[PDB]
Every structure is written in structure tokens, then in C-alpha cells.
Design a protein around this motif. Structure first.
Motif, PDB file in Angstrom:
ATOM      1  N   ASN A 188       0.930  -1.369   0.035  1.00  8.23           N
ATOM      2  CA  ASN A 188       0.007   0.095  -0.165  1.00  8.23           C
ATOM      3  C   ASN A 188       0.932   1.130   0.090  1.00  8.23           C
ATOM      4  O   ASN A 188       0.452   2.455   0.324  1.00  8.23           O
ATOM      5  N   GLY A 189       2.016   1.323  -0.474  1.00 15.70           N
ATOM      6  CA  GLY A 189       3.117   2.354  -0.433  1.00 15.70           C
ATOM      7  C   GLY A 189       3.668   2.991   0.609  1.00 15.70           C
ATOM      8  O   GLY A 189       4.518   3.757   0.521  1.00 15.70           O
ATOM      9  N   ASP A 190       3.419   2.105   1.973  1.00 16.57           N
ATOM     10  CA  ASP A 190       4.405   2.922   2.924  1.00 16.57           C
ATOM     11  C   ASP A 190       5.675   1.934   2.969  1.00 16.57           C
ATOM     12  O   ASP A 190       5.847   0.800   3.106  1.00 16.57           O
ATOM     13  N   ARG A 191       6.850   2.620   2.861  1.00 19.12           N
ATOM     14  CA  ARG A 191       8.005   2.041   2.678  1.00 19.12           C
ATOM     15  C   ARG A 191       9.310   2.644   3.481  1.00 19.12           C
ATOM     16  O   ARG A 191      10.168   2.264   3.408  1.00 19.12           O
ATOM     17  N   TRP A 192       8.822   3.748   4.196  1.00 18.37           N
ATOM     18  CA  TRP A 192       9.712   4.458   4.913  1.00 18.37           C
ATOM     19  C   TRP A 192      10.794   3.586   5.988  1.00 18.37           C
ATOM     20  O   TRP A 192      11.805   3.781   6.397  1.00 18.37           O
ATOM     21  N   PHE A 193      10.106   2.432   6.598  1.00 19.57           N
ATOM     22  CA  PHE A 193      10.676   1.598   7.489  1.00 19.57           C
ATOM     23  C   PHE A 193      11.294   0.408   6.735  1.00 19.57           C
ATOM     24  O   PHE A 193      11.979  -0.359   7.464  1.00 19.57           O
ATOM     25  N   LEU A 194      11.444   0.355   5.589  1.00 21.09           N
ATOM     26  CA  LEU A 194      12.455  -0.636   4.847  1.00 21.09           C
ATOM     27  C   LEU A 194      13.816  -0.011   4.802  1.00 21.09           C
ATOM     28  O   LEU A 194      14.045   0.976   5.124  1.00 21.09           O
ATOM     29  N   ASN A 195      14.954  -1.247   4.805  1.00 19.10           N
ATOM     30  CA  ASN A 195      16.110  -0.950   4.967  1.00 19.10           C
ATOM     31  C   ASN A 195      16.815  -1.817   4.109  1.00 19.10           C
ATOM     32  O   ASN A 195      16.293  -2.831   3.672  1.00 19.10           O
ATOM     33  N   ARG A 196      18.276  -1.681   3.821  1.00 13.27           N
ATOM     34  CA  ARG A 196      19.022  -2.553   3.158  1.00 13.27           C
ATOM     35  C   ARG A 196      19.568  -3.556   3.977  1.00 13.27           C
ATOM     36  O   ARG A 196      20.066  -4.744   3.388  1.00 13.27           O
ATOM     37  N   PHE A 197      19.754  -3.550   5.271  1.00 12.95           N
ATOM     38  CA  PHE A 197      20.252  -4.448   6.248  1.00 12.95           C
ATOM     39  C   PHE A 197      19.185  -5.765   5.992  1.00 12.95           C
ATOM     40  O   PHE A 197      17.952  -5.636   5.603  1.00 12.95           O
ATOM     41  N   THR A 198      19.683  -6.867   6.400  1.00 15.55           N
ATOM     42  CA  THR A 198      19.081  -8.027   6.736  1.00 15.55           C
ATOM     43  C   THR A 198      19.601  -8.597   8.243  1.00 15.55           C
ATOM     44  O   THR A 198      20.332  -7.954   8.720  1.00 15.55           O
ATOM     45  N   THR A 199      18.867  -9.891   8.713  1.00 11.97           N
ATOM     46  CA  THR A 199      19.284 -10.312   9.869  1.00 11.97           C
ATOM     47  C   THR A 199      19.021 -11.690   9.536  1.00 11.97           C
ATOM     48  O   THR A 199      18.338 -12.322   8.873  1.00 11.97           O
ATOM     49  N   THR A 200      19.736 -12.664  10.425  1.00  9.85           N
ATOM     50  CA  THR A 200      19.507 -14.157  10.507  1.00  9.85           C
ATOM     51  C   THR A 200      18.094 -14.116  11.330  1.00  9.85           C
ATOM     52  O   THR A 200      17.649 -13.210  12.072  1.00  9.85           O
TER      53      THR A 200
END
Ligand SMILES: *[C@@H](O)C(=O)N(c1cncc(Cl)c1)c1cccc(-c2cccc(Cl)c2)c1
Ligand SMILES: *[C@@H](O)C(=O)N(c1cncc(Cl)c1)c1cccc(-c2cccc(Cl)c2)c1
Lengths: 306, 306
Positions: free
Chosen positions: A214-226
Motif C-alpha cells: 500500500n505504499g508505506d516504505r519508510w521503514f524498509l532498509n538494506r540490512f538483513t538479519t538471521t
């Protein structure tokens, strides 16, 4: 687009709601074929409710002690029995509005629609989740006992919840439709209390995917985690552990958004450690955990029921 | 106790939902007596939608160009007409499930239940408010055109909304059931946009009263404020002005809680200036404005519909 707490259309359930009266107690019953299901504490007085011997109480009842009203039509009770914490009132008329149905017991973390009723009359419909502590955060006033919770799968109503009581924190406890309580609750007046809850982690992730869709993306990041490292964080914030099955269940949402599940976990990790910093997600300033992955797919893809 | 975004039972509306097909366009229609109401843009192609002359488009249509499916039963169209932005398809069969109904137009700030449908089949029900900018923050995918919004007052369905389109911010625009758009929106493809919104102040106050009724009191204080001084603060935070009529409408809630309306305004003032400081109100970390005073009374008192 858009994302709402969406309940199932309630019509099929509305046609099953009846009023059950026994003595001075009136509550709701569920009328399927020629049986009316209702909480057995309908046969209780207030004094009864402090140490009820329900087998004792029921043997002292007769069919005529049960007044069942289906709208402005009285249903003659021709048999009664107890099954766990529900009464089964056999009536002389099969409900012509009986939908295809099943009695299913749900898992904590799963959602359902509640048709709140009073005096056999539907009042409102809303979506609930079964909390990890087997309570539901519902909206129920005196007289809502017997309101049912349900899901709909094409044309079949899966009844999962019948409302019995409110706990001292204002949360609600009830049974499945075989009369078996969800959680460690009994239908007498004791000092029972909900017991500590956790946040349904897989649902939060599903809702984060709903947000991305639905277009909310601000909380995305390039990091990952196990998975293990995420679960160390989940434990610290009273979130329940994420399992590989949850990751698998989130696969479709992951594939639709292109965001790996573990990447979304890294985002949740940051949201937990940093809060939201004045921002919202899908109109919420809190991490929402009462949408299942199925709920998100249903709403963000568009499945109906007939 | 408890407080949920509660929609009206949808059964009475479900029995009115039909599928309207014209050309390759399929959407939902509302079947009341022998008329099916649907968005007139059903008669449009994609190329039509960029400068539609709907009168031109409709005169080129015949009754047989409209396929109406009520479940697995085809309704023969025997007449058609335009009324503003809705089509009225006269069918040879009166809907035997027609509830008592009215077509009412609601005010921004008022709420309603949306029965989201696809292909004439109800998908979900949820509660919406008419935003001050005459949009609704709904949940609608392609094919939901024609889904209606409604309220129920005892046994009478007041239809207030028919869904037409999604605006670029993901909010939804539609008409009343006479075909008159809510807000400055047209049923063609232009660069129309929602326009700035405000928070519905009287609703926030109502929800604060719902919170108090439900045991959340942390935001209360001994301070009071004048109406004028509150409205100076409302203006600063993009809240709409509070009027004496709002204060009067909040009277019952005030009297039930013992908290003067202006005292609750002082609490809202502090919530606006200070935020919530990590606390929640009725499970929200945001000031909720999609519950009317009526919604709160209904849910915190227990009115049904038959
Ligand atoms: C039905 O009587 C009813 O709806 N009760 C109720 C349910 N949910 C919320 C609220 Cl506020 C009231 C209700 C009313 C009185 C007593 C009880 C009750 C007490 C102890 C054990 C049981 Cl099963 C029921 C429930
Ligand atoms: C019906 O076609 C439909 O439900 N549309 C839709 C509505 N709400 C949300 C979403 Cl994502 C889709 C829809 C689909 C294509 C075009 C339009 C449309 C464009 C411009 C003007 C109007 Cl009235 C409709 C709507």
C-alpha cells in the motif's frame, strides 16, 4: 488499495442468531439445523455462578424452561443437553437459513469476525484475533454472551468462537462451538485473569507487507538479519518467536513485494529498537498484530465469498 | 466493555448486491425493488474515461448491453437511465430481499459501514468515516466500484455511499446513491487529488470518552479550557473547530463519565501539545477520529438492529 480491519460479511451468521431465555437470564444462541447452541451459564442464577454444578443445574431444568425466540417467532425446545460449556437446545424447527458450516477451533494468532448480538439481534461486526493468551480484545456488553466468532471460506461459515465472559482487564474469554474454552478459563465467577500476552510476530510482518503493498516504505532498509538474531530481538520485546513455517507462510507476500522475509524482519527489528519516530504505518502509530498473512493476501488481492 | 471499529451487520445489504457487466467492464450494482444502481462509468471504455460524454455513451447503449447477475440468476434489464453519476437499470424482477431503505447523504465526520464487493459478491465489511475533504480511507481493489456504504437504524438501511474510484493518494471517492459525488471529484480520469484533510475534533473527543468509559484515564487532568482557547489549539494542529453543537452532542458522554466536555478538551489540548509519551488509548498510539459520538454511545450502551 487501502488496508482496513475487515470482517467477513455477516449475513449468513445473522440468519442463525436467536434469543435464549432461561429464568431471568437472556443471551444469544446459534441456531443451526434444529439445534440452538448457547453458553450453558444461561441456566445459572447469580448465586449459581459462584460454584455452579452445571450437571446438577441442568437436570433440574425442563425443555419448557428454555424460551428460544428466533426473531418474533418462538422456537419450541424439544430436547436439551450439555456439551462441555455449551448447551444444545433441540428445537422442533430446522433453521431454513442454516448456511453450510463447520465448527473449527482456531489457533492464537488467527483472526475471525465477531457478530456482536444482544437479545438475538445482531448489533455489529468486527474483526478479532485470538491472542496468544487465548483471550480476545473484543467489544461486548452485558447480554452479548452467545455471540459467535467466525470465518467464511467461499460459502461455508467456520464458527470458531462463542462469547462467554469478560475478564477483569476488559478482555473476553469464550469457547469454540464444541463448548471447549479457549485458554485457562472456566464459566464460573473466580478470580481468573488473562495471563501475560505476547505480540503475534508473524502477523506484524504480514501487516508490514500490507504496508509496502500500500505504499508505506519508510521503514524498509538494506540490512538483513538471521532468523536467530531476529528472534533474540523478538524475545526482548515480548514478541513471539518467528519460525521457518512463518517465513514460509510469508513467502507469497515476500515474492509480491520483492522484500525478503528476513529483510522485513530487520525492518521490524529497527522499528522495535527505535520506535516509529513520529511516523505511522497504514494509519497506525503502533505495530499492528491482528492481521494474518492470509488476511493481508485476501485484502491486498481481493477474494470474495458466495 | 472494549471498543472496536464496528460495522453494522451487513446481511441486509448483501442481499442487494449484484454484478453489472457492460462490454468488458464488470462492477457491482445495488438491487432495490426493480432497480439496479451502479456507477455510470460501467458504460465506459478506457479511452472513454479520459473525456467521457456519458449522455452520448448511454444513448448508444441498449437494455441488452447490460448483463445483471444476481448470484447465479440473470436479471433481465428492461430499462436504463442516468441519474447524475449513477445508472438506474430497471429490471423485470423486484429484489425479494429488498430491505426497508433510504438514500441519505452523510456529512464529513460521519461514519458508515462499507460492504466491499467484487463481481456482485460481498468480500468484507468495515467502518469508514467521510473525511472532511470528502474522501474515505477505504479498502478497495479493482472491481469494487459499486460497493456501497450504509448505516442501519433499527430495520432500515440508510445507503449513503457508492464507491466510484481511487484517488492518487490511495483514498477513495464516490457518490451518494443519487449519483452526486462527495467532494470535488468527477468520474473521468483527470489529475484530481484529495485536497487537504483535517482531523474530526468532535470524534476524537467522543473516542476519548469511549476510552474513559473503558477505563483509560491517564490523559485526564484537573485543568479546563474555554471553547475559544481550545479552538486556538485545534487550528494549530489541523483539527477542525469545535462548536457549541459538538459540545451539546457530547453532553450525554460528558454526563455518563462526569467529565465536562471542556475538561476533555483540555485533555485533548495536552495530548496535542505533548503527544502520548509512549502510552496508548484504546489500543491506539494516535488520536482516533473515525468514531462519532453516536458510535461511542451505540457501542458503550449496546443498541441492536432488527
Ligand atoms: C452474558 O450474560 C454476557 O454477555 N455477559 C458479559 C459478557 N461480556 C462482557 C460483559 Cl461486560 C458481560 C456476562 C454477564 C454477567 C456474568 C457473566 C459471567 C460471569 C462469570 C462467568 C461467565 Cl461464563 C459469565 C457474563
Ligand atoms: C471499478 O472499476 C473499480 O473498482 N475501480 C477501482 C476502485 N477503487 C480502487 C481501485 Cl484500485 C480501483 C476502478 C478501476 C479502473 C478505473 C476506475 C476509475 C477511473 C477514473 C474515474 C472513475 Cl469513476 C473510475 C476505477
Amino acid at each position: 488499495s487501502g488496508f482496513r480491519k475487515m470482517a467477513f460479511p455477516s449475513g449468513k451468521v445473522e440468519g442463525c442468531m436467536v434469543q435464549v431465555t432461561c429464568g431471568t437470564t437472556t443471551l444469544n444462541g446459534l441456531w443451526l439445523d434444529d439445534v440452538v447452541y448457547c453458553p450453558r451459564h444461561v441456566i445459572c442464577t447469580s448465586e449459581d455462578m459462584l460454584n455452579p454444578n452445571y450437571e446438577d443445574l441442568l437436570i433440574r431444568k425442563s425443555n419448557h424452561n428454555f424460551l428460544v425466540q428466533a426473531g418474533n417467532v418462538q422456537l419450541r425446545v424439544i430436547g436439551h443437553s450439555m456439551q462441555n460449556c455449551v448447551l444444545k437446545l433441540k428445537v422442533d424447527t430446522a433453521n431454513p437459513k442454516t448456511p453450510k458450516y463447520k465448527f473449527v477451533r482456531i489457533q492464537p494468532g488467527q483472526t475471525f469476525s465477531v457478530l456482536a448480538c444482544y437479545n438475538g439481534s445482531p448489533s455489529g461486526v468486527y474483526q478479532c484475533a485470538m491472542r496468544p493468551n487465548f483471550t480476545i480484545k473484543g467489544s461486548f456488553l452485558n447480554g452479548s454472551c452467545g455471540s459467535v466468532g467466525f470465518n467464511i471460506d467461499y460459502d461455508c461459515v467456520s464458527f470458531c468462537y462463542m462469547h462467554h465472559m469478560e475478564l477483569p482487564t476488559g478482555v473476553h474469554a469464550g469457547t469454540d462451538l464444541e463448548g471447549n474454552f479457549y485458554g485457562p478459563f472456566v464459566d464460573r465467577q473466580t478470580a481468573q485473569a488473562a495471563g501475560t500476552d505476547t505480540t503475534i510476530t508473524v502477523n506484524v510482518l504480514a501487516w508490514l507487507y500490507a504496508a509496502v503493498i500500500n505504499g508505506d516504505r519508510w521503514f524498509l532498509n538494506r540490512f538483513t538479519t538471521t532468523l536467530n538474531d531476529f528472534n533474540l530481538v523478538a524475545m526482548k520485546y515480548n514478541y513471539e518467536p518467528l519460525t521457518q513455517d512463518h517465513v514460509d507462510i510469508l513467502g507469497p507476500l515476500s515474492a509480491q513485494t520483492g522484500i525478503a522475509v528476513l529483510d522485513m524482519c530487520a525492518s521490524l527489528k529497527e522499528l522495535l529498537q527505535n520506535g516509529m519516530n513520529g511516523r505511522t504505518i497504514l494509519g497506525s502509530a503502533l505495530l499492528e498484530d491482528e492481521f494474518t498473512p492470509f488476511d493481508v493476501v485476501r485484502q491486498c488481492s481481493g477474494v470474495t465469498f458466495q
